[PDB]
Amino acid sequence: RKGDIFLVRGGMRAVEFKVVETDPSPYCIVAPDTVIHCEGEPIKREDEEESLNEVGYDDIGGCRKQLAQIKEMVELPLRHPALFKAIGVKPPRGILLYGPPGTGKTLIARAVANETGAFFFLINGP
Amino acid sequence: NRPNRLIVDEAINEDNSVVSLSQPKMDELQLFRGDTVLLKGKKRREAVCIVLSDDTCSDEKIRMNRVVRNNLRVRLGDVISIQPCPDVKYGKRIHVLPIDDTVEGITGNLFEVYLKPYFLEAYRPIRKGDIFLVRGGMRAVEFKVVETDPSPYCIVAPDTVIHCEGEPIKREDEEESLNEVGYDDIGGCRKQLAQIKEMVELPLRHPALFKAIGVKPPRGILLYGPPGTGKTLIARAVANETGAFFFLINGP
Ligand SMILES: Nc1ncnc2c1ncn2[C@@H]1O[C@H](COP(=O)(O)OP(=O)(O)O)[C@@H](O)[C@H]1O
Ligand SMILES: Nc1ncnc2c1ncn2[C@@H]1O[C@H](COP(=O)(O)OP(=O)(O)O)[C@@H](O)[C@H]1O
């Protein structure tokens, strides 16, 4: 469809391609009978849009059901914020992700922040 | 010596606008259960409630809920005036307004959710200029009675319309919000709270006594226990119930 970004994986890399022009509108199913117009000139994408190279649930694997617990923990406070203003209850405002180094705790934090839309701030220890 | 016969005490049963009296003496008060009873507190204020009998209540004191106690402005261990009034007058279009900073907890229609389920068959006598607490929607809202067709008080019955305002109005500041902590909010400890209350009563509840008598009351108490056991709750409740000015010196 017009004005969508689709991700192509290859060459040990991932490139997102925008569909800016198309003969039929607004969308068309691609078939092996339509030529491809060549531009080869990268164009900056609109900033409000989120780059797909950012971390997400898929990038965080190996933990399974701890990520589900964190998602349930963080959904209402972040995914439905106005609810807590009209209801008197305290959501979880402090979570200690603990484990051996390299287990993806920073991955979990970044993915939760991005998926829920929350503004992620990193307070590095040192 | 013809005492007042009415004292302030904590309420054991869950109920609002209900006052319990000692079972041993019914003729003294000359009132048995299920009758409107007037009560004079302090600062020229009075309240109306319903009286019952409790075997556990001590004859010296009269158990009463925190809402009514706040209405009278009396505190635990205080002495007030009671007056058995079999007379009671119904009301017409009893008026109520939102009070204090409690707001944003209701959207659209705001009277069917809270008032209707509570005043339906309750027969709670409402008096002018009193605040009563309604529990619902995982929230607690205190409603002021500013207007009422009969004066000064009227027993609510299922035949009087309700006037709708839906506009919260700031309550007088000297009055104490019932959302603050109290003895009821502090449970699970039982008889340690009694020890702290006895410990702190005279120094705070009767301060002038120690100036005319030479003795030292307890001026240092160490509440110790596992974290989360309500020590801060106990301190705040003791400060509020005794009227003392509570100051928090946070460790960090
Ligand atoms: N469970 C996992 N699933 C996918 N990638 C992981 C996982 N754990 C670690 N990684 C990879 O290892 C990198 C380092 O882990 P990281 O979470 O940043 O450090 P820490 O665990 O101390 O917070 C991560 O950037 C990520 O790429
Ligand atoms: N015995 C209790 N009765 C009712 N609520 C309690 C009790 N103990 C703890 N709580 C609740 O847990 C909260 C935290 O306990 P708190 O007393 O503030 O911490 P600390 O014990 O370190 O002083 C309190 O705000 C209160 O709501």
CSV table of C-alpha atoms and ligand atoms in Angstrom, one decimal:
chain,number,residue,atom,x,y,z
A,1,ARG,CA,0.0,0.0,0.0
A,2,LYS,CA,1.0,3.6,-0.6
A,3,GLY,CA,3.2,5.1,2.2
A,4,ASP,CA,4.2,2.0,4.1
A,5,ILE,CA,7.6,0.8,5.2
A,6,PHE,CA,8.5,-2.9,4.8
A,7,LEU,CA,11.7,-4.5,6.2
A,8,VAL,CA,14.1,-6.6,4.1
A,9,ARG,CA,16.6,-8.9,5.7
A,10,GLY,CA,19.9,-9.7,4.0
A,11,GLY,CA,23.6,-9.2,3.8
A,12,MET,CA,23.8,-9.4,7.6
A,13,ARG,CA,21.7,-6.3,7.6
A,14,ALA,CA,18.1,-5.1,7.7
A,15,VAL,CA,16.9,-2.3,5.5
A,16,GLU,CA,13.4,-0.7,5.6
A,17,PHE,CA,12.0,0.4,2.2
A,18,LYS,CA,9.3,3.0,1.8
A,19,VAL,CA,6.5,2.7,-0.9
A,20,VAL,CA,6.1,6.3,-2.0
A,21,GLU,CA,4.8,5.8,-5.5
A,22,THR,CA,2.5,3.3,-7.1
A,23,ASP,CA,0.5,3.2,-10.4
A,24,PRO,CA,-2.7,1.9,-8.8
A,25,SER,CA,-4.2,3.5,-5.7
A,26,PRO,CA,-4.4,3.3,-2.9
A,27,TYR,CA,-2.9,-0.2,-2.7
A,28,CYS,CA,-2.0,-3.1,-5.0
A,29,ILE,CA,-1.1,-6.7,-4.6
A,30,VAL,CA,2.4,-7.3,-6.0
A,31,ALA,CA,2.6,-9.9,-8.8
A,32,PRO,CA,5.4,-11.2,-11.0
A,33,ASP,CA,4.2,-9.1,-14.0
A,34,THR,CA,4.9,-5.5,-12.8
A,35,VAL,CA,8.2,-3.8,-13.4
A,36,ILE,CA,10.1,-2.1,-10.6
A,37,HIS,CA,11.1,1.5,-10.8
A,38,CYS,CA,14.7,2.2,-9.7
A,39,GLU,CA,15.7,5.2,-7.6
A,40,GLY,CA,18.6,4.2,-5.4
A,41,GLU,CA,18.4,7.5,-3.5
A,42,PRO,CA,17.7,7.1,0.2
A,43,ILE,CA,15.2,9.6,1.6
A,44,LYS,CA,14.7,10.5,5.3
A,45,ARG,CA,11.6,9.0,6.8
A,46,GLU,CA,9.1,11.1,8.9
A,47,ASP,CA,10.5,11.4,12.4
A,48,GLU,CA,7.3,10.6,14.3
A,49,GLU,CA,7.4,7.1,12.8
A,50,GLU,CA,9.4,4.5,14.8
A,51,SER,CA,12.3,2.8,13.1
A,52,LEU,CA,11.9,-1.0,13.1
A,53,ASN,CA,15.6,-1.5,14.0
A,54,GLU,CA,14.6,-0.6,17.6
A,55,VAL,CA,14.3,-3.3,20.2
A,56,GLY,CA,11.1,-5.2,20.7
A,57,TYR,CA,9.4,-8.3,22.1
A,58,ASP,CA,10.8,-10.4,19.3
A,59,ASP,CA,14.4,-9.3,19.9
A,60,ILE,CA,14.0,-10.5,23.6
A,61,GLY,CA,13.8,-14.3,23.7
A,62,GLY,CA,15.1,-17.1,25.9
A,63,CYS,CA,13.2,-15.8,29.0
A,64,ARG,CA,9.6,-16.5,27.9
A,65,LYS,CA,7.3,-16.2,30.9
A,66,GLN,CA,9.3,-13.6,32.7
A,67,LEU,CA,8.6,-11.2,29.9
A,68,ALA,CA,4.9,-12.0,30.2
A,69,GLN,CA,5.0,-11.2,33.9
A,70,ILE,CA,6.7,-7.8,33.2
A,71,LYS,CA,4.2,-7.0,30.5
A,72,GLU,CA,1.3,-7.7,32.8
A,73,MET,CA,3.0,-5.8,35.5
A,74,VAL,CA,3.6,-2.7,33.3
A,75,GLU,CA,0.5,-2.7,31.0
A,76,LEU,CA,-2.0,-0.7,33.1
A,77,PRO,CA,0.4,1.9,34.5
A,78,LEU,CA,1.7,2.7,31.0
A,79,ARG,CA,-0.7,1.3,28.5
A,80,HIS,CA,-3.8,2.7,30.3
A,81,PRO,CA,-2.5,5.6,32.3
A,82,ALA,CA,-5.8,7.6,32.7
A,83,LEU,CA,-7.4,4.6,34.4
A,84,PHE,CA,-5.4,5.1,37.6
A,85,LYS,CA,-6.4,8.7,37.9
A,86,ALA,CA,-10.1,7.8,38.1
A,87,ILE,CA,-9.5,4.7,40.4
A,88,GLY,CA,-7.6,4.7,43.7
A,89,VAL,CA,-5.0,1.9,43.6
A,90,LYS,CA,-1.2,1.8,43.4
A,91,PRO,CA,0.4,0.2,40.3
A,92,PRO,CA,3.9,-1.2,40.5
A,93,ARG,CA,6.3,1.7,40.3
A,94,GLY,CA,9.5,-0.3,41.1
A,95,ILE,CA,10.7,-3.5,39.5
A,96,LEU,CA,14.1,-5.2,40.1
A,97,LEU,CA,15.2,-7.2,37.1
A,98,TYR,CA,18.0,-9.3,38.5
A,99,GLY,CA,20.1,-12.1,37.0
A,100,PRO,CA,23.5,-13.0,35.7
A,101,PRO,CA,25.1,-10.3,33.4
A,102,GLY,CA,24.2,-10.6,29.8
A,103,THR,CA,20.7,-12.0,30.4
A,104,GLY,CA,19.0,-9.2,28.5
A,105,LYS,CA,17.7,-7.1,31.4
A,106,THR,CA,18.4,-3.9,29.5
A,107,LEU,CA,16.8,-5.5,26.5
A,108,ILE,CA,13.6,-6.2,28.6
A,109,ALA,CA,13.6,-2.6,29.9
A,110,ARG,CA,14.0,-1.1,26.4
A,111,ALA,CA,11.4,-3.3,24.8
A,112,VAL,CA,8.9,-2.6,27.5
A,113,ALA,CA,9.5,1.1,27.1
A,114,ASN,CA,9.2,1.0,23.3
A,115,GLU,CA,6.2,-1.3,23.1
A,116,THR,CA,4.2,0.6,25.8
A,117,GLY,CA,5.3,4.0,24.3
A,118,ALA,CA,6.8,5.1,27.6
A,119,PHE,CA,9.8,7.5,27.6
A,120,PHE,CA,12.8,5.4,28.4
A,121,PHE,CA,15.5,7.0,30.5
A,122,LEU,CA,18.8,5.2,31.3
A,123,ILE,CA,20.6,5.8,34.6
A,124,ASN,CA,23.8,4.0,34.0
A,125,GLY,CA,25.4,2.7,37.2
A,126,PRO,CA,28.9,4.1,36.7
B,1,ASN,CA,-22.8,13.6,90.1
B,2,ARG,CA,-25.2,13.7,87.2
B,3,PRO,CA,-22.5,13.1,84.6
B,4,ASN,CA,-22.9,13.5,80.9
B,5,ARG,CA,-23.0,9.7,80.6
B,6,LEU,CA,-21.7,9.9,76.9
B,7,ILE,CA,-18.1,9.1,76.0
B,8,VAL,CA,-16.2,8.6,72.7
B,9,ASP,CA,-14.8,5.2,71.8
B,10,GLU,CA,-13.8,3.2,68.8
B,11,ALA,CA,-16.4,1.4,66.8
B,12,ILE,CA,-16.1,-2.4,66.3
B,13,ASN,CA,-19.0,-3.1,63.8
B,14,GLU,CA,-18.8,-1.8,60.2
B,15,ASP,CA,-21.5,0.9,60.0
B,16,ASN,CA,-21.9,4.6,59.6
B,17,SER,CA,-24.4,6.8,61.4
B,18,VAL,CA,-24.8,4.1,64.1
B,19,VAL,CA,-23.9,4.4,67.8
B,20,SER,CA,-23.7,1.5,70.3
B,21,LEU,CA,-24.6,1.7,73.9
B,22,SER,CA,-23.9,-0.6,76.9
B,23,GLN,CA,-26.5,-3.3,77.3
B,24,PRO,CA,-26.6,-3.2,81.2
B,25,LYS,CA,-28.3,0.2,81.4
B,26,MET,CA,-31.4,0.9,79.2
B,27,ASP,CA,-33.5,3.1,81.5
B,28,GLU,CA,-30.7,5.6,82.2
B,29,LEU,CA,-30.6,6.6,78.6
B,30,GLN,CA,-34.3,5.5,78.4
B,31,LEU,CA,-33.7,4.4,74.8
B,32,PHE,CA,-33.6,0.9,73.5
B,33,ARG,CA,-32.6,0.0,69.9
B,34,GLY,CA,-33.8,1.6,66.6
B,35,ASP,CA,-34.5,5.2,67.6
B,36,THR,CA,-33.1,8.6,66.5
B,37,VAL,CA,-30.7,10.0,69.2
B,38,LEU,CA,-29.2,13.4,69.3
B,39,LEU,CA,-25.7,14.1,70.5
B,40,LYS,CA,-24.0,17.4,71.4
B,41,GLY,CA,-20.3,17.6,70.9
B,42,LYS,CA,-18.2,20.8,71.0
B,43,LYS,CA,-18.2,24.2,69.3
B,44,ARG,CA,-22.0,24.3,69.3
B,45,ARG,CA,-22.6,21.3,67.0
B,46,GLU,CA,-24.8,18.2,67.2
B,47,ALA,CA,-25.5,15.1,65.3
B,48,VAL,CA,-28.3,12.5,65.0
B,49,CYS,CA,-27.9,8.8,64.7
B,50,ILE,CA,-29.5,5.4,65.6
B,51,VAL,CA,-28.7,3.6,68.8
B,52,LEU,CA,-28.2,-0.1,69.4
B,53,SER,CA,-26.9,-2.3,72.2
B,54,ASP,CA,-23.6,-4.1,72.4
B,55,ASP,CA,-22.6,-6.6,75.1
B,56,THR,CA,-18.9,-5.8,74.6
B,57,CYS,CA,-19.3,-2.1,75.1
B,58,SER,CA,-18.3,-0.8,78.5
B,59,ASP,CA,-21.0,1.1,80.4
B,60,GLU,CA,-18.7,4.0,80.9
B,61,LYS,CA,-18.2,4.8,77.2
B,62,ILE,CA,-20.3,4.8,74.1
B,63,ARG,CA,-18.9,3.2,71.0
B,64,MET,CA,-19.2,5.3,67.9
B,65,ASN,CA,-17.9,5.4,64.3
B,66,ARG,CA,-15.2,7.8,63.1
B,67,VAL,CA,-17.6,9.5,60.7
B,68,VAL,CA,-20.0,10.6,63.4
B,69,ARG,CA,-17.1,11.5,65.7
B,70,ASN,CA,-15.7,13.8,63.0
B,71,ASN,CA,-19.1,15.3,62.6
B,72,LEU,CA,-19.2,16.1,66.3
B,73,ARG,CA,-15.5,17.1,66.2
B,74,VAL,CA,-15.0,15.0,69.4
B,75,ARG,CA,-12.0,12.6,69.7
B,76,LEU,CA,-11.5,9.2,71.4
B,77,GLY,CA,-11.9,9.3,75.1
B,78,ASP,CA,-13.8,12.5,75.1
B,79,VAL,CA,-17.1,13.2,76.9
B,80,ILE,CA,-20.2,14.6,75.2
B,81,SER,CA,-23.9,15.1,75.8
B,82,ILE,CA,-26.5,12.6,74.6
B,83,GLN,CA,-30.3,13.3,74.3
B,84,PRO,CA,-32.8,10.5,73.5
B,85,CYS,CA,-35.2,12.1,71.0
B,86,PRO,CA,-37.9,9.7,69.9
B,87,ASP,CA,-39.2,12.5,67.6
B,88,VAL,CA,-37.9,12.4,64.1
B,89,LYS,CA,-39.0,14.4,61.0
B,90,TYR,CA,-38.8,13.2,57.4
B,91,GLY,CA,-37.3,15.5,54.8
B,92,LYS,CA,-38.0,16.8,51.3
B,93,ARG,CA,-35.5,17.0,48.5
B,94,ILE,CA,-32.5,16.5,50.8
B,95,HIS,CA,-29.6,18.4,49.3
B,96,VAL,CA,-26.0,17.2,48.9
B,97,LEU,CA,-22.9,18.6,47.4
B,98,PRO,CA,-19.4,17.2,46.6
B,99,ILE,CA,-16.9,18.3,49.3
B,100,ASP,CA,-13.2,18.5,49.7
B,101,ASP,CA,-10.7,17.8,46.9
B,102,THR,CA,-12.3,14.4,46.1
B,103,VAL,CA,-12.9,14.8,42.4
B,104,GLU,CA,-12.4,13.1,39.0
B,105,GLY,CA,-13.6,9.8,40.5
B,106,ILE,CA,-17.0,10.1,38.7
B,107,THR,CA,-17.9,10.7,35.1
B,108,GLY,CA,-21.2,11.5,33.5
B,109,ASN,CA,-24.0,10.6,35.9
B,110,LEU,CA,-22.7,11.0,39.4
B,111,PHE,CA,-25.7,10.3,41.8
B,112,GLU,CA,-26.9,6.8,40.9
B,113,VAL,CA,-23.5,5.3,41.6
B,114,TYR,CA,-22.9,6.4,45.2
B,115,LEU,CA,-25.9,8.0,46.9
B,116,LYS,CA,-28.7,5.7,45.7
B,117,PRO,CA,-27.3,2.3,46.8
B,118,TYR,CA,-26.6,3.7,50.3
B,119,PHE,CA,-29.6,5.9,51.2
B,120,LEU,CA,-32.0,3.2,49.8
B,121,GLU,CA,-33.8,1.8,52.9
B,122,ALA,CA,-31.0,3.0,55.2
B,123,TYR,CA,-33.2,5.5,57.0
B,124,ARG,CA,-30.1,7.4,58.0
B,125,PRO,CA,-31.1,10.8,59.7
B,126,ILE,CA,-29.2,13.6,57.9
B,127,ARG,CA,-28.6,16.9,59.5
B,128,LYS,CA,-27.7,20.3,58.0
B,129,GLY,CA,-24.0,20.8,57.4
B,130,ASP,CA,-22.6,17.3,58.0
B,131,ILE,CA,-20.3,15.2,55.9
B,132,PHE,CA,-21.0,11.6,55.3
B,133,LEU,CA,-18.7,9.1,53.6
B,134,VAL,CA,-19.8,6.9,50.7
B,135,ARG,CA,-17.6,3.9,49.7
B,136,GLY,CA,-17.7,2.6,46.1
B,137,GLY,CA,-15.8,2.3,42.8
B,138,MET,CA,-12.6,1.5,44.7
B,139,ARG,CA,-12.9,5.0,46.1
B,140,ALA,CA,-14.3,6.9,49.1
B,141,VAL,CA,-16.2,10.2,48.6
B,142,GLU,CA,-17.4,12.5,51.4
B,143,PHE,CA,-20.7,14.3,50.7
B,144,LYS,CA,-21.8,17.5,52.4
B,145,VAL,CA,-25.4,18.2,53.3
B,146,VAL,CA,-25.7,22.0,52.7
B,147,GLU,CA,-29.4,22.3,51.9
B,148,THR,CA,-32.5,20.6,53.3
B,149,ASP,CA,-36.2,21.4,53.2
B,150,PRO,CA,-36.8,20.7,56.9
B,151,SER,CA,-34.6,22.1,59.6
B,152,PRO,CA,-32.4,21.5,61.3
B,153,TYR,CA,-32.3,17.7,60.6
B,154,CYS,CA,-34.5,15.2,58.9
B,155,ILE,CA,-34.6,11.4,58.7
B,156,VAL,CA,-34.2,10.2,55.1
B,157,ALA,CA,-37.0,8.1,53.8
B,158,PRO,CA,-37.8,6.6,50.4
B,159,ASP,CA,-40.3,9.3,49.5
B,160,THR,CA,-38.1,12.4,49.2
B,161,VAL,CA,-36.6,13.4,45.9
B,162,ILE,CA,-32.9,14.2,45.7
B,163,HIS,CA,-31.6,17.5,44.3
B,164,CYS,CA,-28.8,17.2,41.8
B,165,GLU,CA,-25.8,19.6,41.8
B,166,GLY,CA,-22.8,17.6,40.6
B,167,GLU,CA,-20.5,20.6,41.4
B,168,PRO,CA,-17.9,19.9,44.1
B,169,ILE,CA,-17.4,22.6,46.6
B,170,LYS,CA,-14.3,23.0,48.9
B,171,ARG,CA,-15.0,22.1,52.5
B,172,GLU,CA,-14.0,24.3,55.4
B,173,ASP,CA,-10.3,23.8,56.2
B,174,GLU,CA,-10.5,23.5,59.9
B,175,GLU,CA,-12.5,20.3,59.3
B,176,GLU,CA,-10.6,17.0,59.1
B,177,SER,CA,-10.8,15.0,55.9
B,178,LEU,CA,-11.9,11.4,56.7
B,179,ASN,CA,-9.5,10.0,54.2
B,180,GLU,CA,-6.8,10.6,56.8
B,181,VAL,CA,-5.4,7.6,58.7
B,182,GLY,CA,-7.1,6.5,62.0
B,183,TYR,CA,-7.5,3.6,64.4
B,184,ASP,CA,-9.7,1.7,61.9
B,185,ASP,CA,-7.0,1.9,59.2
B,186,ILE,CA,-4.5,0.3,61.6
B,187,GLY,CA,-5.4,-3.3,62.2
B,188,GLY,CA,-3.6,-6.6,62.7
B,189,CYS,CA,-1.6,-5.5,65.7
B,190,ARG,CA,-4.5,-5.1,68.2
B,191,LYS,CA,-3.2,-4.8,71.8
B,192,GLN,CA,0.0,-3.0,70.8
B,193,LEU,CA,-2.1,-0.1,69.6
B,194,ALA,CA,-3.9,-0.1,73.0
B,195,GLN,CA,-0.5,0.1,74.7
B,196,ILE,CA,0.5,3.1,72.6
B,197,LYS,CA,-2.8,4.8,73.1
B,198,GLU,CA,-2.5,4.5,76.9
B,199,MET,CA,1.1,5.6,76.6
B,200,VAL,CA,0.3,8.7,74.7
B,201,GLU,CA,-3.2,9.7,76.0
B,202,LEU,CA,-2.2,11.9,79.0
B,203,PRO,CA,0.8,13.7,77.4
B,204,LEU,CA,-1.3,14.7,74.4
B,205,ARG,CA,-5.0,14.2,75.2
B,206,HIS,CA,-4.6,16.0,78.6
B,207,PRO,CA,-1.6,18.2,78.3
B,208,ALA,CA,-2.4,20.8,81.0
B,209,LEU,CA,-2.5,18.1,83.7
B,210,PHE,CA,1.2,17.6,83.6
B,211,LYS,CA,1.9,21.3,84.2
B,212,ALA,CA,0.0,21.2,87.5
B,213,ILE,CA,1.4,17.7,88.5
B,214,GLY,CA,5.1,16.8,88.7
B,215,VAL,CA,5.6,13.6,86.8
B,216,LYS,CA,7.3,12.7,83.6
B,217,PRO,CA,5.2,11.2,80.8
B,218,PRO,CA,6.7,9.0,78.1
B,219,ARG,CA,8.5,11.3,75.6
B,220,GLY,CA,10.3,8.6,73.6
B,221,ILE,CA,8.8,5.5,72.1
B,222,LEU,CA,10.6,3.0,69.8
B,223,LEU,CA,8.2,1.2,67.5
B,224,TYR,CA,10.2,-1.6,66.1
B,225,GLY,CA,9.4,-4.5,63.8
B,226,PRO,CA,9.7,-6.0,60.4
B,227,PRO,CA,9.3,-3.5,57.6
B,228,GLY,CA,5.8,-2.9,56.4
B,229,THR,CA,4.2,-3.7,59.8
B,230,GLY,CA,2.4,-0.3,59.9
B,231,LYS,CA,4.7,1.6,62.3
B,232,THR,CA,4.2,4.8,60.3
B,233,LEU,CA,0.5,4.1,60.3
B,234,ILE,CA,0.5,3.8,64.1
B,235,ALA,CA,2.4,7.1,64.4
B,236,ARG,CA,0.2,9.0,62.0
B,237,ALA,CA,-3.0,7.6,63.6
B,238,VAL,CA,-1.9,8.5,67.1
B,239,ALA,CA,-1.0,12.0,66.0
B,240,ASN,CA,-4.3,12.5,64.2
B,241,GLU,CA,-6.6,11.0,66.9
B,242,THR,CA,-4.9,12.9,69.7
B,243,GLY,CA,-4.7,16.0,67.7
B,244,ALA,CA,-1.0,16.3,68.0
B,245,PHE,CA,1.0,18.0,65.3
B,246,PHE,CA,2.8,15.1,63.4
B,247,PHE,CA,6.3,15.8,62.1
B,248,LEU,CA,8.1,13.2,59.9
B,249,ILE,CA,11.9,13.0,60.2
B,250,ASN,CA,12.6,10.6,57.3
B,251,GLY,CA,15.7,8.5,57.9
B,252,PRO,CA,17.4,9.2,54.5
C,1,LIG,N1,17.6,-13.4,26.4
C,1,LIG,C1,18.1,-12.7,25.2
C,1,LIG,N2,17.4,-12.7,24.0
C,1,LIG,C2,18.0,-12.0,22.9
C,1,LIG,N3,19.3,-11.3,23.0
C,1,LIG,C3,20.0,-11.3,24.3
C,1,LIG,C4,19.4,-12.0,25.4
C,1,LIG,N4,20.3,-11.8,26.4
C,1,LIG,C5,21.3,-11.1,26.0
C,1,LIG,N5,21.1,-10.7,24.7
C,1,LIG,C6,22.1,-9.9,23.9
C,1,LIG,O1,23.1,-9.7,24.6
C,1,LIG,C7,23.3,-8.1,24.7
C,1,LIG,C8,23.8,-7.7,26.1
C,1,LIG,O2,22.8,-8.0,27.1
C,1,LIG,P1,22.3,-6.8,28.0
C,1,LIG,O3,20.8,-7.0,28.3
C,1,LIG,O4,22.3,-5.5,27.2
C,1,LIG,O5,23.1,-6.7,29.4
C,1,LIG,P2,22.5,-6.8,30.9
C,1,LIG,O6,21.9,-8.2,31.0
C,1,LIG,O7,23.6,-6.7,31.9
C,1,LIG,O8,21.5,-5.8,31.1
C,1,LIG,C9,22.2,-7.6,24.4
C,1,LIG,O9,22.3,-6.2,23.8
C,1,LIG,C10,21.5,-8.6,23.5
C,1,LIG,O10,21.8,-8.3,22.2
C,2,LIG,N1,-1.1,-3.7,60.5
C,2,LIG,C1,-1.6,-3.0,59.3
C,2,LIG,N2,-3.0,-2.6,59.2
C,2,LIG,C2,-3.5,-1.9,58.1
C,2,LIG,N3,-2.6,-1.6,57.0
C,2,LIG,C3,-1.1,-1.9,57.1
C,2,LIG,C4,-0.6,-2.6,58.2
C,2,LIG,N4,0.7,-2.8,58.0
C,2,LIG,C5,1.0,-2.2,56.8
C,2,LIG,N5,-0.1,-1.7,56.3
C,2,LIG,C6,-0.1,-1.0,55.0
C,2,LIG,O1,1.1,-1.1,54.4
C,2,LIG,C7,1.7,0.4,54.1
C,2,LIG,C8,3.2,0.4,54.4
C,2,LIG,O2,3.4,0.2,55.8
C,2,LIG,P1,4.2,1.4,56.6
C,2,LIG,O3,3.7,1.4,58.1
C,2,LIG,O4,3.9,2.7,56.0
C,2,LIG,O5,5.8,1.1,56.6
C,2,LIG,P2,6.7,0.9,58.0
C,2,LIG,O6,6.2,-0.3,58.7
C,2,LIG,O7,8.1,0.6,57.6
C,2,LIG,O8,6.6,2.1,58.9
C,2,LIG,C9,1.0,1.2,54.9
C,2,LIG,O9,0.8,2.5,54.3
C,2,LIG,C10,-0.4,0.5,55.1
C,2,LIG,O10,-1.2,0.9,54.1
